[PDB]
Amino acid sequence: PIRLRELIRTIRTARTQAEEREMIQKECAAIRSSFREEDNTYRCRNVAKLLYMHMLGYPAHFGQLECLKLIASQKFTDKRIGYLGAMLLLDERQDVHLLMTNCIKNDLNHSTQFVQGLALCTLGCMGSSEMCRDLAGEVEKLLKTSNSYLRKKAALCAVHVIRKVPELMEMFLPATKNLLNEKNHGVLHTSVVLLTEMCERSPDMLAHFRKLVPQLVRILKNLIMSGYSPEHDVSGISDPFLQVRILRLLRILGRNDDDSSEAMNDILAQVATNTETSKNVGNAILYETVLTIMDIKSESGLRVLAINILGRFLLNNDKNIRYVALTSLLKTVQTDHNAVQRHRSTIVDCLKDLDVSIKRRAMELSFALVNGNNIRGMMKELLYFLDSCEPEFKADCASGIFLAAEKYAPSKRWHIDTIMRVLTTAGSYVRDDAVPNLIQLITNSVEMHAYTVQRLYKAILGDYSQQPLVQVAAWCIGEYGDLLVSGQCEEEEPIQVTEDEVLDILESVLISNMSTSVTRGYALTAIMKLSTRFTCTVNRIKKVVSIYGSSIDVELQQRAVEYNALFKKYDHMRSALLERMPVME
Amino acid sequence: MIHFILLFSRQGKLRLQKWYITLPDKERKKITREIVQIILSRGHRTSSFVDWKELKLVYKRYASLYFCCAIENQDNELLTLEIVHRYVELLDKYFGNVCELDIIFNFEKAYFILDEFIIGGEIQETSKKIAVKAIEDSDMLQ
Amino acid sequence: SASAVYVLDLKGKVLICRNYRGDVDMSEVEHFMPILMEKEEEGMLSPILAHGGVRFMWIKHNNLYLVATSKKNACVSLVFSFLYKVVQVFSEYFKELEEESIRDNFVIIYELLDELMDFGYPQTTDSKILQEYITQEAPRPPATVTNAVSWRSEGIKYRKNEVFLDVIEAVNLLVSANGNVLRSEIVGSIKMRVFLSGMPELRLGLNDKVLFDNTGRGKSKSVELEDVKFHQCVRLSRFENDRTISFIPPDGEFELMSYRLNTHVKPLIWIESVIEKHSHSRIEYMVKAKSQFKRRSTANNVEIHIPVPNDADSPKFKTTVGSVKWVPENSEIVWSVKSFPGGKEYLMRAHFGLPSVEAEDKEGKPPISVKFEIPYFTTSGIQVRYLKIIEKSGYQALPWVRYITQNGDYQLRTQ
Amino acid sequence: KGENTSLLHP
Amino acid sequence: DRKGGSYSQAAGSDSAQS
Amino acid sequence: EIFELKAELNSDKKEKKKEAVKKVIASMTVGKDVSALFPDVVNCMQTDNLELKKLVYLYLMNYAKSQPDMAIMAVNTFVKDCEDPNPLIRALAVRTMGCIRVDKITEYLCEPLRKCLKDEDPYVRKTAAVCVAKLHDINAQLVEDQGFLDTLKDLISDSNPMVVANAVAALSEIAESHPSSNLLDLNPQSINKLLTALNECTEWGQIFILDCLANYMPKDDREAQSICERVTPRLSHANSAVVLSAVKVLMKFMEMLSKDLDYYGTLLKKLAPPLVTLLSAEPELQYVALRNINLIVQKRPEILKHEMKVFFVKYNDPIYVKLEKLDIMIRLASQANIAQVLAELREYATEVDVDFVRKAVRAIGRCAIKVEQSAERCVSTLLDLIQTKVNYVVQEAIVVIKDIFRKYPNKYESVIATLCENLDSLDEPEARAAMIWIVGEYAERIDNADELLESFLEGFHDKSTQVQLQLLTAIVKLFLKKPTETQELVQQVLSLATQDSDNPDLRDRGYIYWRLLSTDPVAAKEVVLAEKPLISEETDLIEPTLLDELICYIGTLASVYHKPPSAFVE
C-alpha cells in the first residue's frame, strides 16, 4: 500500500516521458494486482494512485468495478475514494453508472450527513438521462426537508435533474413553493437559481413564479441595506453571488410584462446608483443590472442611466471591463440602437486594440451596429480592418462584410463592387459556403451583368488559386457569357474579350493542380453551357471534353463522358436543355 | 453554470480538473490540450476572457499555476472571476499558505473542497466560513 | 552545407550552438520546438525540419537533439554524417551523453566544435587523432592529419603487440504470423582492438567465396557475403583489384570490415507459441522454444521477450527451464534463460487474469523478440585464414580473434 | 522554483 | 576466459596458397 | 556583477583573466546578453596562453555583427597572429578572420589570406582555403579583386590531399553561387589527378572529391568507363554519404555509358548490394536512403527489381521510414512478388496507426490498379478488411473498391452483393460518395438499390455538394436503367435538388437532368448511361527532364523533397 505522497514524489522524480510512462506502468501493474486480490485494507492508496495516473494521462478502464465496490463500502475513507473515482472516471458514456443507481439509493437514506451529501454531489456531477428517472422520487423527498446544509444540495440535484430531464420539472413545482423566506444565503441562492432554471426551461411556471416578484424585490432591498456581514461580504460587497442571482432573476422575469418591470424599477434605480464599482464585484453587479434593465421593459430613465454607465465603463482601461462593456453593447444592439450610435468612435478604436477578445468584441459590435445609412461609411472601415486583420479574423471579417452587404446593401452596384473587392482581397479566407449565397445573389440580380462579367473576367485572368473567387468567376462566366462578349462570333476589333481567352482560362483551371474538384466541376459546367450561349468558339470544347472524359475522378469522368455524349450525339438537342435556371430567394 | 474548471501550471502540467459536461475521454483530452495551448499562447493583457467554442473561457492565474473556467454565454463574466477568487481564498484558508507543492500532494482535499463548494457547474455556498466549517466537520469524521 | 550546428535539450533549451556560415539568424531556434511539437502531434514529425526558408535537420541523441539549421540546398547526407561523427567524438571523449557534461565540458566542447568544422565543411573527425590537439586538461597539430594516414598516429610504441578481434554475428529473422520467415539477414561484424607498436599494415585474409573462386578453391566452406564494407583504413583499390584487404589498423577498437549477406538456413531457435486468450476471462500462453542450433553450442543469456497483455494482472507462469518474469514497464513476458544447450526444448504455459471491462483503444500486436547470444558459434561458416602484420622495424605479432553469435533483428510476428 | 510561493500571498 | 567465445589466435596468411 | 566582471577582466593577473573569460563564455552560452562588454574584452586579447585567445576569438565572432563598430580594434591583433610560428594559432586566426561578419574588416584581411594561401603547413592551407570561401560568400567582388581564384585552382594540383580536398570544396561552393561564368571545370587530366588523391582522402575529403565529378559531363565511353572503374571502389566505404556519393556519381556517369557493353551490366549488378547495405543504416539515414532509392527507382528500375525482402518495414522502424517503405514497395511492386506484397499489406493492416493504415490501404489500392493479375486477390483482401469491422479500415476498403470499380469493373459484379450490406452508416465523405457511385454505376447485381438510396436521400440537401452530386448521379442512373421501381425516386430527387437545392453546380446538374428526362428518356440511356473510355491513371513517375536534373542533385535537400533545387531555396 504505497502512499499517495510517495507516488507523487516518484512521478516528480521522472524526467523523460518514456521513463515516466514506464514508472506509471510499473505502478499500475501493482495496482491491478492488488485490485485482483480483492484488497480492502489499503485500497484507498491504490485508488489514489490510480486516480493520479488517470489524471496524469494513463488509462483507468480496469479500475471501474473497484470504484463501484468501494462506493457500496462502509468505510468513510473508502466511500470518499469511491465517490471521487465515480466523479472523475465515471460519466454517462461509461455505461457502468447504471449499477451506481442502487448504491446511490442505498446511500440516499443514510443517517450520516456526509455520505448522503457525497452521494447527492456525485449524482449531480454525473447525472444521466436514466439515473435521474429512477432517482427523481428520492430527490423530492430531500427537497422538502429543513436541513440548511442539505437544502442547497437538494436544489442543485433538482436543477441537474431538470437540465437532464426537462419533462420532470412538473414534479418540482409543489416542492419549491413558499421557499423565499430562507435566512441562509446559500439556501436562498439555491432557491433563486432553481426558480431561474424553471423559468428558463418552460414559460408555464412564469405566471406562477411571477407572483413572487415583490418578495424578491424586498429580499434584494434588504440585502442591499445589509451592506455589512462577516460571511459572504467580499471587497465591501455582501452576497455578490446572491446579488448576481437576484439580478439575473429580475432580468429574466417581466421582460415582456409591465407590472413585473414596474415592480423592480425602483430596486433597479436604487441599485444603479447605490453601488460601488471600485472592485470587480461592483463592476460585475453593475453589468448584471444593466443587462437585466436592457432585457426588461424598464423606464426611460433606467435606460439613460444604463447608457451612461456603459459609456463610463467603455473608457475603463481594464481589459475585463472593456470586454464586459462590449458584450453589453452587443447584447443591447437591437434594443436602444439609436443610443448605441454615440459610441461609434469607441467601437472603431476597439478594433485596433491589442486584445484578441477585445478586437473580436469590437468587430462584432461594429457588424451589429451597421444600419441602412452608415453602411456606406462603415464599408471603408470594414475593408481597412479586413486588410490589416488577424489571420483568424480575416475570414470572419469577410463573412460579416458579405452578410452586411446582403442585408443592408445601399445599392446593387455598390454591393457587387464590395463583394468583388472582398473576394479579391480575402483570397483563401472566404468560406466555401458563401459561394452558393454569392451565386444566388448574382442570379437574383438581372440588371448589372455586363460590368460584373467584365470585372470577373479581369479578376480571373490574374490569379486562379482562390477557390471561392475562381468558382464565383466560373459561375459568372457560365451564366453571362452572352453578355461578357458581344458580337464575338468571328474575328473583330481588339477588345477585352476575344472568345478564346475564356476557353483557355477554363482549360487551365481544369488542368491546373490548384483545384479541389469543386472549381473544376464549375469550370466544366461553364464550358458545357458555353456551347449554346457562345456560338463563335464552337467545335473546340468538344475535343477538350472528350479528352477530359478519361479523368481519374469518378464524378469528373462521368461529367466529361456525359458532355462528350451530348456533344457527339445530341448536338441539336444540346440547346434544348441549356436554358437559364430559375432565380429564387 | 461552469462547464469545466481546470487548474494547470505554467509549464502545461494540470494540477486540477473538473468538467461538468459529459464528453469523450479523447475529446476531453483534445479540448484540454487546446485550452492549454490557447492560454499558454496568450499575453498578460488579453482581458482574462476567451470565447473558445462559444464558451467564455476565463483565465485568471494568481501564481505560476493558472485557473480556467467554462461559462456559457448566459451570465456575467465578472461573477466567474469573483467565484474563482473566493475559491482560491477558501483553499488558502483551509490549507494555510497554499503553494504549488501542496496542490499535487493534497489534490484529494482540493477536489473535496471543490465538490462541497461548486456542484454541477453552479455554486453551493455563497459564504466562505460556512463552507470551511463544513469541510472541517467532514474531514474530522475519519 | 550546415549554417549553424546547435545542441538543444529536452525542454527546448539550446545547450550549445556553433554557427558555421552565419546565413541564418540565431533566433530561428525558438520556433524549432513548436514546429517539432506540431509535427509530432500531427504525425508529420521528421528529423529534417523546415522553418520557412531555413531547414533544421537533426537527429535525437541520448539526451538532446543535435539540430543543425541550413538555408541552401546543402547535402542532408553530409549533415547527417557530420552529426554522427560529432556524436562519436563526444562518446569517445565523454563516457555519457547527457546534460551533465554539456554544461560542464563547454571549454573543450567549444574548441572541438571550432576545430571539427569550419564554414560548414568538416575537416577532422578522428577522436584518437583529435585527442592530440584538443584536450580538456596546445602544441602543434600532429602530422597524421596533414599526412594521408589520418587514422594511425606514428610513433606509437607498446611493450607487447597483441590485437584482439571480434567476429560478432547478428542473427536477424523476420518470421511472419503465418510461421514463415520473411526477412532473414545476417550481418557480419569484424571489430578489432589493435594495440601494437609503430604503424603496422594489416593484411586480413579469410575463406571468402569470391576469393576461393578466384584462387580456384571454390569447393570448401566459404562465406558468401552479399555486402562487404571495409573501414576507412581498408584500401578500396586493393579490395577491388584481387579481393586484397590491406590496411593499417588504428590504435584501439574500431570497425574494420562488416560482412552482410542473406541467410537461407533454418532458425537456430524455433518458437511455438499459442494464445488461448478467453474473452475478458483468462488467457493461455502455450509457448514452446526449440533450439535448432548445434548441440555443442550454448546460448548464453537467452532472453525471449513474449508480449503479454497490457492490462493483464495476477499472472501465473508454468514453464520448464529458464526464468520467466513479467515487467510492467515493458508489458511483456521476459523468457530469461541463462544457458541454453543446443537442441534444448523449453515449454511454457502462461496463465494471467484480465479485467471484465474492455480496453478503450486497441494496442496492436508487438512481435516476440529473442535475445539469444551464443558465443563461439559461426553460423555463416566464415573463418579467418590469415592476418599479415608487417612492420618496418620488424616484430612478431600475436593477433587474437573471437567469434560471438547473438540475436539481432530476431523478432517473431504474433498471430 | 516558483511553486512554493503562495497563490495569493495573504 | 570471456563470455561470447574464447579468443583464438589468427594466422598470418594463406600458407596453402603461396 | 557586470562591474565586478569588468574589473576582473581589466586586471593584470592571468589567473583572474581566465576565470573571467570562462564566466563570460558561460553567460553567453547560458543566454546572457554580454555584447555590451565587447570593448572591455578587446584589451584582454593579446595573451600568450592559447586557452583565453580561443575564447576571445569565439566571443568576437559571436559578437561581431552585434557591435561592428567596436570590432575595428581587432585587425592589428589578427595581423599579428597570422604570422605566429605555431600552426594552430595561425589556423585559429584564419578561421576567426573569416567568421567576422564585418563589411569594413574583410577589406584589410586580404593580405593575411594571400600570405596564408601559400603556407607550407597543410592545416594553415586548409584554414586559408576555408577563409577564402567565407570571404567570397561574404563579398564576391573583394575575392575576385584579390585574385584568389588562380590560387584556389592551383591548390588542387598540389600536395596535401586534405588541403586539396578543402580547396576543391571551397571552389565548388564559390561556383555554386557563381553565375556559371568562367567555370572552374577541368579537363580529364584534372579528373585523373583528383581520382589519384581520392584513395588517400579522408571521409570528409572523399565527399568533396566525389562532388566535383557530379558537375563534369563525360563525352566518351572510355573516359566514362575509367570514371566508373575508379568510382567502383567507393561502394565499399564505411561512410553512408561516401557510398551515396559514389552511387550518385555512377548514376550521373551512366547517362553516357552504353548498355551494349558489359560495363553497364557490371555497374547495375554492383549497385544493388550497395542499396541493400544503405537500407540497413541508422533510422535517420533511412529516410534519405528511401528518397534516393525512389529517385533512382524511376530511372533504372532494373537494378533493384529482385530486391523485395529488404523493403519490408521493421517493427521498430520509425514512422517516416515506415511510410517510405510502403512507397518503395509500391514502386517496386510486381506480379512476381504480388503474394509477398499482399501478405505485407495484410500484416500492415493490423497496426494502430491511422495514418499508417491509410498509407497501407492506398499502397494496396495502387498495387491492385498497377497489376491486373492480382485483382482477385486484392478484392478478396479488401472484402476481408471490410469484414474486419474497422472504421478507418472500412473507409479505406470502400475507397479502394470504388477506385477499382472505375478501373476494372468488368468482373466486379461478384462483390456488389457483399458491399450491399457492409455498414453503410459510415459518414465519411470519401467513403459514402464512393459507395453511392459504385451503387449507381453497378446498379445491376443488387435488386435493392432503390431501397438503399432511400436512406441516403434523407439528408441529401444538407449532406455535401460532392455527396449530393453522387447521390443525384446514382438516382439518375437507376432511373435510366430501371425506371419502374425508381419512377417516383427520380421526381423526388429532381424536386429536392432543383427546388430546395441552392448549390450552383448542383442546381445546374439537377436542371440538366430534369431537362434530359423531360426531353428524351430513351436518349438518356445512350447519353447518361454510356460506356466511358478507359480512365487514364495518374502516373507516379516523374518527368524525364526533372529526373535528369534530380539525378545530378543526389543527397541534397532537393532530393528528399523530390523538388527542383530552385523551387525550395530562398
UniProtKB/Swiss-Prot annotation, chain A:
Can you tell me where the transmembrane regions are? none
Task: Write out the tissue specificity statement of the associated record.
Answer: Widely expressed.
Q: Which GO terms describe its cellular component?
A: AP-1 adaptor complex; clathrin-coated pit; clathrin-coated vesicle; early endosome; lysosomal membrane; perinuclear region of cytoplasm; presynapse; trans-Golgi network
* Keyword annotations from UniProtKB, A to Z: Coated pit, Cytoplasm, Cytoplasmic vesicle, Golgi apparatus, Membrane, Protein transport, Transport
Q: How the protein sits in the membrane?
A: Peripheral membrane protein
Compartment(s) where it occurs, according to its Swiss-Prot or TrEMBL record: Golgi apparatus; Cytoplasmic vesicle, Clathrin-coated vesicle membrane; Cytoplasm; Cytoplasm, Perinuclear region
- Please verify whether the record's keywords include Manganese: no
- Give the domain of life: Eukaryota
Q: Name one GO biological process term.
A: vesicle-mediated transport
* Subunit structure of this chain's protein: Adaptor protein complex 1 (AP-1) is a heterotetramer composed of two large adaptins (gamma-type subunit AP1G1 and beta-type subunit AP1B1), a medium adaptin (mu-type subunit AP1M1 or AP1M2) and a small adaptin (sigma-type subunit AP1S1 or AP1S2 or AP1S3). Interacts (via GAE domain) with RABEP1. Interacts with EPS15. Interacts with SYNRG/gamma-synergin. Interacts (via GAE domain) with AP1AR (via coiled-coil domain). Interacts with CLN3 (via dileucine motif); this interaction facilitates lysosomal targeting.
- According to its UniProt record, which protein family does this protein belong to? Belongs to the adaptor complexes large subunit family.
Recorded protein name is AP-1 complex subunit gamma-1
What is the organism of origin for this protein? Mus musculus
Q: Which gene encodes it?
A: Ap1g1
Curated annotation (Swiss-Prot), chain C:
Q: Does the keyword Transport apply?
A: yes
According to its UniProt record, where is this protein located? Answer: Golgi apparatus; Cytoplasmic vesicle, Clathrin-coated vesicle membrane
Which residue intervals define the domain MHD in the entry? 160-413
Biological process (GO) annotations held by this record are:
endosome to melanosome transport; intracellular protein transport; melanosome assembly; platelet dense granule organization; vesicle-mediated transport
Pfam families recorded: Adap_comp_sub (PF00928), Clat_adaptor_s (PF01217)
Q: How is it modified after translation?
A: Phosphorylation of membrane-bound AP1M1/AP1M2 increases its affinity for sorting signals.
Alphabetized UniProt keyword annotations:
Acetylation, Cytoplasmic vesicle, Golgi apparatus, Membrane, Phosphoprotein, Protein transport, Transport
Q: How does it sit in the membrane?
A: Peripheral membrane protein
Naming one, the record's GO cellular component terms include: trans-Golgi network membrane
The Phosphothreonine modification is found at T144, T146, T215
Q: Which residues carry this modification: N-acetylserine?
A: S1
CDD domains in UniProt:
AP-1_Mu1A_Cterm, AP1_Mu_N
Do you know which InterPro entries this protein is assigned to? Adaptor_comp_med_subunit, AP2_Mu_C_sf, AP_mu_sigma_su, Clathrin_mu, Clathrin_mu_CS, Longin-like_dom_sf, MHD
User: What biological function has been recorded for the protein in this entry?
Assistant: Subunit of clathrin-associated adaptor protein complex 1 that plays a role in protein sorting in the trans-Golgi network (TGN) and endosomes. The AP complexes mediate the recruitment of clathrin to membranes and the recognition of sorting signals within the cytosolic tails of transmembrane cargo molecules.
Which family does the record claim for this protein?
Answer: Belongs to the adaptor complexes medium subunit family.
Q: What's the name of the protein?
A: AP-1 complex subunit mu-1
The organism encoding this protein is: Mus musculus (Mouse)
Gene from which this protein is expressed? Ap1m1
UniProtKB/Swiss-Prot annotation, chain E:
Tissue spec. comment = Ubiquitous.
Q: Where in the cell is it found?
A: Cell membrane; Endoplasmic reticulum membrane
Record region (Disordered): 2-18
- Where along the chain is composition biased (Low complexity)? 9-18
| Residues with Phosphoserine modification | S6, G12, S13, S15
| Disease the record associates with this protein | Alleles A*02:01 and A*24:02 are associated with increased susceptibility to diabetes mellitus, insulin-dependent (IDDM). In a glucose-dependent way, allele A*02:01 may aberrantly present the signal peptide of preproinsulin (ALWGPDPAAA) on the surface of pancreatic beta cells to autoreactive CD8-positive T cells, potentially driving T-cell mediated cytotoxicity in pancreatic islets. Allele A*24:02 may present the signal peptide of preproinsulin (LWMRLLPLL) and contribute to acute pancreatic beta-cell destruction and early onset of IDDM.
What family is reported? Belongs to the MHC class I family.
- Known role: Antigen-presenting major histocompatibility complex class I (MHCI) molecule. In complex with B2M/beta 2 microglobulin displays primarily viral and tumor-derived peptides on antigen-presenting cells for recognition by alpha-beta T cell receptor (TCR) on HLA-A-restricted CD8-positive T cells, guiding antigen-specific T cell immune response to eliminate infected or transformed cells. May also present self-peptides derived from the signal sequence of secreted or membrane proteins, although T cells specific for these peptides are usually inactivated to prevent autoreactivity.
Q: Which residues of the full protein are shown?
A: 338 to 355 of 365
Swiss-Prot record, chain F:
Report the locations given in the UniProt record: Golgi apparatus; Cytoplasmic vesicle, Clathrin-coated vesicle membrane
Q: How does it assemble?
A: Adaptor protein complex 1 (AP-1) is a heterotetramer composed of two large adaptins (gamma-type subunit AP1G1 and beta-type subunit AP1B1), a medium adaptin (mu-type subunit AP1M1 or AP1M2) and a small adaptin (sigma-type subunit AP1S1 or AP1S2 or AP1S3).
Q: Which protein family is it in?
A: Belongs to the adaptor complexes large subunit family.
**What does the function comment of this entry state?**
Subunit of clathrin-associated adaptor protein complex 1 that plays a role in protein sorting in the late-Golgi/trans-Golgi network (TGN) and/or endosomes. The AP complexes mediate both the recruitment of clathrin to membranes and the recognition of sorting signals within the cytosolic tails of transmembrane cargo molecules.
Expressed in which tissues: Widely expressed.
Q: Which UniProt keywords apply?
A: Acetylation, Cytoplasmic vesicle, Deafness, Disease variant, Golgi apparatus, Ichthyosis, Membrane, Nitration, Protein transport, Transport
Domain of life of the native organism: Eukaryota
Residues bearing 3'-nitrotyrosine are Y561
What's the protein's topology in the membrane? Peripheral membrane protein
What is the annotated signal peptide range for this record?
A: none
Sites where N6-acetyllysine occurs are at: K305
Q: GO biological process: what's one of them? A: melanosome assembly
Q: Which GO terms describe its cellular component?
A: AP-1 adaptor complex; cytoplasmic vesicle membrane; cytosol; early endosome; Golgi apparatus; Golgi membrane; intracellular membrane-bounded organelle; lysosomal membrane
One annotated GO molecular function is: clathrin binding
Q: Which residues cross the membrane?
A: none
Q: Carries keyword Repeat?
A: no
* Name under which the protein is recorded: AP-1 complex subunit beta-1
Q: Please state which portion of the whole protein this structure contains, as first and last residue out of the total length.
A: 14 to 583 of 949
Q: What is its main location?
A: Golgi
